[PDB]
Every structure is written in C-alpha cells, then in structure tokens.
Amino acid sequence: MKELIYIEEPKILFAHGQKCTDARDGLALFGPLNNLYGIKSGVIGTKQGLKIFRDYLDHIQKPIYNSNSITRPMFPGFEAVFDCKWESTGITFKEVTNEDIGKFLYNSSTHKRTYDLVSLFIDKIISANKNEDENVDVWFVIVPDEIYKYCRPNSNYDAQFHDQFKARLLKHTIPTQIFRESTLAWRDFKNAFGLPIRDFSKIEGHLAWTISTAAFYKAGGKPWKLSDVRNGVCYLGLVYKKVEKSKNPRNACCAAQMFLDNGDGTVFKGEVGPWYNPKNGQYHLEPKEAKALLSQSLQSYKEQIGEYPKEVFIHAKTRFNHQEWDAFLEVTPKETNLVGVTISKTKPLKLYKTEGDYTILRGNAYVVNERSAFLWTVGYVPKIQTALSMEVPNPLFIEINKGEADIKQVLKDILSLTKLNYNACIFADGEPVTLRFADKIGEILTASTDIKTPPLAFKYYI
Amino acid sequence: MRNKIFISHATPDDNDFTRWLALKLIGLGYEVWCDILFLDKGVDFWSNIEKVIREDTCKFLLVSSSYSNQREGVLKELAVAAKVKKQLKDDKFIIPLAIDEQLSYDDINIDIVRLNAIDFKMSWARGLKDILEAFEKQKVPKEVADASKSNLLYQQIFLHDKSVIEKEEIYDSNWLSILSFPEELRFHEYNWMLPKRFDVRELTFPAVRYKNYLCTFAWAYDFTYHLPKTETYHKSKTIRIPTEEILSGSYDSNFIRNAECKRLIVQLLNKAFELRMKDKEVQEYEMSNKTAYWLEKGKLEKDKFEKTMLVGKQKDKNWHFAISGASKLYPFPVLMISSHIFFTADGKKLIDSSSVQHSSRRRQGKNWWNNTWRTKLLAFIKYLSDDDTSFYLEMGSEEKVFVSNEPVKFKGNVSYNIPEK
C-alpha cells in the first residue's frame, strides 16, 4: 500500500486580529478587515430595472435564512456584517429608454448589434462619470434578459457582452457589476408553467452573501486576507490565449496575474505574438516578451512593497522549455529564488472509500516524489458536513517543473491560495486563484486587441 | 452580584438570532446565559434555570417571536420572571424582542404587550444599537470588549463535533499494478522487405515503427502468415534488450533513448489492452480521443455481476457503465481504467445525439455516490478476470503480462465521523 500525508486547512485573518477557517462565519461574527463610511451606488438601466435594484437593495438589509442552515449559514444583513450603509436612497440613476434598446436589438449581424449595445452603455457610463461632480463608487448595470439572450455567440471584436463591457472600460478604470433582471427578482419572473425561471428559494442566503461580498470588495474594502503568511512571497500565474481572428494560426496573447498576501491581485498584459504551436498544442514565449512580463511583475512588486521579493512562483498549466526559462532567469535579481510549477487537472486517479457513501477528506496528499505530487483540494470537509463537489474528486497534479523548493511547502502554499476569491464568499475552491480566472481574463483581454493599458487591479477585470 | 443577562426563546428554530446576539454581547464585555451555551446538561436543568432567574440574572430579554409567544417553557420562565420582577421592583426587567413580521399585535401575550418592544424586525444592527443604548442607560457593570472570548466559545461549543480525528482508513484506487514483464524487447530488421507505407497496427501481435527497425514483443518468425514477402528473414538480425533494465531506466545507447523506449512500451500496452478486450466480447465506443468499452444489455444475467447493478434503466433510456484503458510508468508500472456512463434506447444501439448523451450522463451521475462507483468499478474489473488473482494480457505467442485484479490500496491516518442526518 501507499501512505497519504495530511495537510491542515489554512486560516484567514479577519477583524480584531482573529482567525477563522470559514469566511462567512468570521464575517458574521467579527466583521471585515477594513471598513468604509458607506457605499455610494450608481445604477444605469430602465426605470423597471432601477425599481428592481432598489427593491433588492432594501431587501438584503433584512435577515434571510437558508433551508440547510449548517451548510449555508444565514445572512444577518449588510449593515450587520459589513458595517457599511448600502442604502437604496442617495444613488445616482441613469436612464436607458426601451426605444433605444429596441433600436439596436433587432440587428441581424450579431457582432454589430453587440458593438452598438455595448457602446450605448459605455457612452452613458463615461458621460455620467465625467460631467457629474458626484463620486460614485461602483456602477451596477442592470440589463434586461432579452439583451443577454440576444448578445451571446451563435445566437474584429468578440461576441460576448460581459467580456466586451469589461474590456472597453479597461482604459477608464471604472468598476462595474453586471446583473440581469431575472436574478435580482427571481420570484417575479415566471415561466408559462407559472414556476420561476431561477429557483433561489433554497440558496437565497448564499446568493446574498456572494453579492454582498462582491459589492464590498469592488467598492474598495478588503473582506479578508490569509493569516499564516510567509514574509515577502509573491505568486505569478501565466495565461495564454490563441486569437481566432488572426490569419496566422500561431498568434497568441499572454497575461500575468500577480498575487500577494492580501488576495487583491494585479494583472499585467503581454504583447501578442506567435506563441502557439499547432503541432503539439503547447504555448511558449519568445525571450523578449518573457523579459518584459517578468520585469513588469517585479517592478510592480517593488512599487507596492519597496523591497525585492524573497521568492517567486510562476503557476501555469504547461511545462516550460529551456529558452523561456533562461530568458526569465536573465531578469530576476540574484537574491531572489525562482520556482516554476505546473498545475493540471487531467491526471485520472480517483480514491474510493471502502465504507460509507462519502468521499475522501479534503487536504490529503500523495507525494509521488520530491518533484511531483497530487493534492486533493476538492475533497470532503467536516466543517459544513458536505463535500464541495459531486461524484468523485479529481486531484490536482502539482509538479515542480523548474527550480528547487520543498514540495510540502509548495503543497501548503497552493492549498492556502484557494481561500482568496472575493467574487464568492464560499468555503474554498478546487483551483488556486492564480489560475482560477484564466479563461475569463483571457477572453476579456482578447475581446479587444488594441489594449495598451498599464497594470490594473483585479476588480476592473472580473 | 447579578451580571448575567438571560435569553429565553423557542428551540431550535430561534437559535440563529439567539446565537448572534449572545456571541456579540459576550464579546462586547457582558455575560450572557442561554440554554445552548454550555452543552453539558443533566444537572437538574429546571432547578438551574430557577437559580439563575431568581438569584443571578440582572436583565431578561424574551424573544417575542410567534413560536416563543406561548410555549410551555417560555410561559413558565415568564411567570418566574414576573415574580422576580415584582421582587426587585424593576419595571423594565422584561424586554420583548419582536423578530418577525407575521406576528400580529393582538396575538402577543398579554403580559408583554404593555411593555415597550425593542425592534429587531427591520434591521438587526439598529436593534443591537438600541439594546446597547438601553444597557448604557440602565448602567449594567461590564469590562472592555473582547471578541477572542467569542472566538473561543464558538470554537468550543459549535466547532466541537466537526473536527478532525486520527482514524485509520483504507482507500481503493483505479490502478492495476503490472506483475511480470517479458524478458526482452526485440527490434527486427524490416522496411526494406516489408512493403512501404505499411500500417503495422492492423497486425495481430502489436508492433511499432522505429525508422529502420520494427519494435515488438515477439520473436522474429511470428509474422510469416501476415507478410509472406518477409519469409526470408534470418533470426540472427534481431536486437534484444532486457525489459527489467528499461524499467530501472539505466539504459543509454545511440540506438534508443530511454524515454522513447518507454513511450513505445506504452503504445504497445495500449494496443494490447485494446485487442485483449476486443476478445472479451465487449462493445466499443470511439470517444473524441480514446475508446471506451461497455457491455451490451443481456450480456450477463440480470445485468448484474455478484451484487453490483452494472446496466440499468432511467426513464425511457438504458445506462451502461463503461471503462477505458490506458498505461503509464514511473510511479511504478501502472494501468489506468477510466469510468464513463453511456446511454441507449434499444439496449444495443448507441444514441447518436452527443448533447442528449451528456445531459443524460449528468442526470444519472448526479445520484451516484462513492460506494456505487467503487462497487461498479470493482465488479467490472472482476468480470474481466481469468483467474482468482490476476488476468493475462497477450504480448505474443509465448509472452504475456499478468495484471492483478486488485487495485492498489492506500492507507490514511486522518478521518472524521459520518453525519447523523
């Protein structure tokens, strides 16, 4: 037989110097790390959309329980947990008449109509941000269902509304949150059978938790940062995306997501070039782009902190070849240690418990050798008495591709990197945050090919 | 001296707000009493309630919800509270806390309608501020606030039965260990005597092309029937390499690299598995990149092996458990089996709609848990067994690799307790 080691669940730091293992309980019991005066809200949409948003904003103030109160804890209310005044009064409303929506909703060319609808939102957004002396925090774009139904692919710019909307404001740095009318008012919207389209009567508290956490984060506050920290350690995640529009099949685009203790990462954009090999399907960078990306990464780190990092980790989905790695090693200061790790979900090893219908406990690891190991990040947990995923988990394959580092410390680090996802106040996620948002960021940055922007905070992308 | 602040309520429905306010107040500097704070029980609970209500309590808040309006315990505690209220001559000893909108004003109990109710229906934070203002006005002794006591209480009362315990467990994987290997791997001399552009994959004993030579697990003279053009081969031009030393990985020569030889062995094992399960009368399904093999309906009696329900029915469809094969080395020699679910209508002909197949797979697998998957995989492995210990996989006329039918066991030192519900 083969032995399994156990990696304990990490703790995240919260208000009043306390540490918890679940973010929701800590938030409801102690409060967020950094507190604001209040949320100044701005909403653009139809009058009915404004009414729905106002109703929901007043509704989230009341307590709201859930059917299974041991797995999905209750929501006391935004003022109770976050101690911020997110009120339905004193918000800036911009009106979009239904006639304007209809004018562009009936176009045959999907790319064209998507472009016109996006611009019809963006011009109002920028005009409201510029002309007004008011300082709104975030812009809540409430969109009718029909636009989303008719603004998706197969229904020189991408054909998705969310990606285009996030891409075009990358140059203006405007935090926006997109909601459908059917989600904020799921009870009101019904089918021809009389039943709701989206049944949230079972997870209403969890939905409110996620919405509240996203709104608090995107307004400027930090809900939580992990507690047990190694000083001066930065994380880097590479993302490649093949551009479909390009005539040359080898053209590809690269991006680097940089993370610190706080879980509020930065995004660096790379130069589009021939990185994709159509023979074996692996992406690799030329030396110059690698130097540029890494130099920007440590320049940003020095700007944020002031001293060069003690360690650097470059998480990626594929192995690095030699020219890429020596190009990377050209730039790094000699006082810093570089590690390059590969994380992939394609290894089919499933462990079955001999008794009981439940699966393997989350956190157990099988270290194959001092350079490669498995990690069960999506296994069963006892804190909420339910596993995170259905069927049987597939562990992550963590192999130290380049550099010298202890495998156990890497395992603990990658397990810790799973608790920082402000878009969803959930117990954990099966993928590290440095690689969790690869597809979304890649598609968003590919949606516009003329992007020339400085490094930006994460909230402008998600 | 009276410092304890009593909370009365109906259980377990009103546990949420009771826990919230108690924890916040006990982290704010006060001392709070309620039924669910101790989890010790058994020490004459009613006498303890009388003792705390009469002797130690300073203030008394009653959660005037719909359930707690007239419950026997709440009514009894309210009677004792009225008695002690008359004793201490405190008009504001009883504080109602309305926590719902559905309780009409006429419905509330007579003894608490007169007293002023502090609002907790619209927002909990404003209600907490109102309670804090009331306690500043009534001058209740207290010390500095400290949320670490709240943390410790939450950890020791409510994080008690959901911790990690040191318990041994045995887990079953989906990997078959290869027991024995042929003595030697043979490279022949061909491609000047076989026809050019030859697909050796259609041959019976598997083989692969390596530039000039032909790599296979077979003697020189076993391909006469397939290629009569190659009967002129002389048995002295076949280079033979021990397989155990390849497993050790210490081979290094200009002829072959170790990684390339291992890849050739992997391809040979994959092909051999393909034909060996071709011989076992199981239907094949060519997926996007692999081939998965399943059993037709009625191939085995009652569609069950031993006590495992392999082939089943869902609505107007029939679902089959299918397996796919692959090989790997250097953890140690291993064969992987990958599980799949497929669907059909008549029991023999697969559904050609990929989206319908995926949706049915999701729907059927949403109700399958670990024990079901494990038992089905074990049963399907046992079905292919030729002996009671292992099954052979053909390499040639006199060469075989014997693969055990018991997956590798894993031993775990940390476990938990199965939930009651």
Numbering used by the authors:
A (entry chain B): 1 to 155, 201 to 507
B (entry chain C): 1 to 421
What wording appears in the published article?
Short prokaryotic Argonaute proteins (Agos) are associated with NADase domain-containing proteins (TIR-APAZ or SIR2-APAZ) encoded in the same operon. They confer immunity against mobile genetic elements, such as bacteriophages and plasmids, by inducing NAD+ depletion upon recognition of target nucleic acids. Target DNA binding triggers tetramerization of the TIR-APAZ/Ago complex by a cooperative self-assembly mechanism, while the heterodimeric SIR2-APAZ/Ago complex does not assemble into higher-order oligomers upon target DNA binding. However, the NADase activities of these two systems are unleashed via a similar closed-to-open transition of the catalytic pocket, albeit by different mechanisms.
To investigate the interaction mode between TIR-APAZ and Ago proteins, we first co-purified the binary complex from Maribacter polysiphoniae (termed TIR-APAZ/Ago complex hereinafter, also known as SPARTA)30 and determined its cryo-EM structure in the presence of gRNA. We were able to build the structure of most regions of the TIR-APAZ/Ago complex, with the exception of the C-terminal region (aa 419–452) of TIR-APAZ and residues 161–200 of the Ago protein. Although the majority of the gRNA could not be resolved, two nucleotides (2G–3A), defined as the seed region, could be clearly seen. This observed seed region is much shorter in length than the seed sequences pre-organized by other previously reported eAgos and pAgos. In the TIR-APAZ/Ago–gRNA ribonucleoprotein (RNP) complex structure, the Ago protein is bracketed by the separated TIR and APAZ domains of TIR-APAZ protein, which are connected by a helix (aa 146–158) and the following loop, termed here as the bridging region. Ago protein, together with the APAZ domain of APAZ-TIR protein, creates a positively charged channel to potentially accommodate the gRNA–target DNA heteroduplex. The RNP complex structure is nearly identical to the apo TIR-APAZ/Ago structure predicted by AlphaFold36, with an RMSD of 0.936 Å, suggesting that gRNA has little impact on the configuration of TIR-APAZ/Ago complex, possibly due to the short pre-organized seed sequence or the lack of PAZ domain, which is absent in short pAgo system. The TIR domains in both apo TIR-APAZ/Ago and RNP complexes are catalytically inactive, but target ssDNA binding could efficiently activate the NADase activity. Therefore, our structures presumably explain why target ssDNA binding initiates the dimerization of Ago proteins. It is intriguing to note that a long loop (aa 314–332) protruding from the PIWI domain in the target-free complex would pose steric barriers to the propagation of the gRNA–DNA duplex at ~13–15 bp positions. In the resting state, the NADase activity of TIR is likely to be self-inhibited partially by the flexible BB-loop.
